[PDB]
Symmetry: C3
Subunit: 133 residues, 3 copies
């Protein structure tokens, strides 16, 4: 996979995603949302997309990742949308690991206006069908 910039790291075959780094120092105030730049640009393999999903270390710090969909055709810089959920300010240092990028396949289909057939054992059910237990 062709990449531009230095904000991404190789991973081993047994690891699911690639570590993303912060391109510059970022300061998030309580409840604030910013689009952390990674300084990375890439060309995803045809038929695949990239998923930005959080890491253990930063997640347990009160930070979450929003959005997270890198389109196959995207050619711009990858940004990590992060929200600070703590009641205090947080600071993400330059080149600090902030997220993961996982390469997943996506199916492309045309949407056919039709009629949904109740041909399944669940059909209508949702939102707690088997209970809490």
């Amino acid at each position: 996979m062709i990449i531009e910039g230095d904000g991404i790291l190789d991973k081993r075959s047994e690891d699911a995603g690639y570590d993303l780094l912060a391109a510059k120092e970022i300061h998030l105030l309580p409840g604030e949302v910013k689009v952390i730049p990674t300084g990375v640009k890439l060309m995803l393999p045809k038929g695949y997309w990239g998923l930005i999903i959080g890491k253990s270390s930063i997640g347990s710090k009160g930070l979450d990742v929003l959005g997270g969909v890198i389109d196959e055709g995207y050619r711009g810089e990858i940004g990590v949308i992060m929200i600070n959920v703590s009641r205090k300010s947080i600071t993400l240092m330059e080149r600090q690991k902030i997220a993961q990028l996982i390469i997943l396949p996506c199916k492309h289909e045309v949407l056919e206006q039709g009629k949904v057939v109740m041909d399944s054992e669940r059909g209508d059910n949702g939102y707690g069908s088997t209970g809490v237990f």
Copy 2:
């Protein structure tokens, strides 16, 4: 893919997901969680599932998507579970883009009670194994 309702939009081949719309005007109070209706019903391809994941625009507004798993067998209406993380009220207009739907394959297996073999280079490690850097 057969779909019912008007709350979903075609996407181009290079895009990963389909845009989901709000079926009606929704008002989220600070810290509130509601299941935004999309008025959409669908029949996912056998062996696949649907993933509800946020978009750039709304994410950076202090809104997040919870849950997000549409089962292959689901036949009901798709709802987007959204939480308002800001300290103010937010309003999602009718037919406003609120999320993305991405079609991913899922593996089905039987769970075999057995013994995990420490046959890997990580094995036990987790939660910040290489540090912050």
Copy 3:
């Protein structure tokens, strides 16, 4: 798939993920983040990874899942990183369903420092390219 522990449940072929249970009673204070133990260990199929993603029932309760990436090579105990976003304390009972585990394939590639070609119809665009509507 070989598994150890009792904190996971079989699923039917039409369902995308497996239900994860809390290994012990957990008490989350407002805004708190804890790594809920599941008491589960597993050996993911080669080339695949596990995704921890929330469920309907608990999501609409003000609880969210952070991180969520189980590496193919992981051999330790699976933990669910949960944040309490409400203004009150929440309690997750023992063996209560708290999340879902979905088995997804991941592509492994080497990162080739190169030059991104503006060979797509989007290329640079991102963060609200078609508007809100």
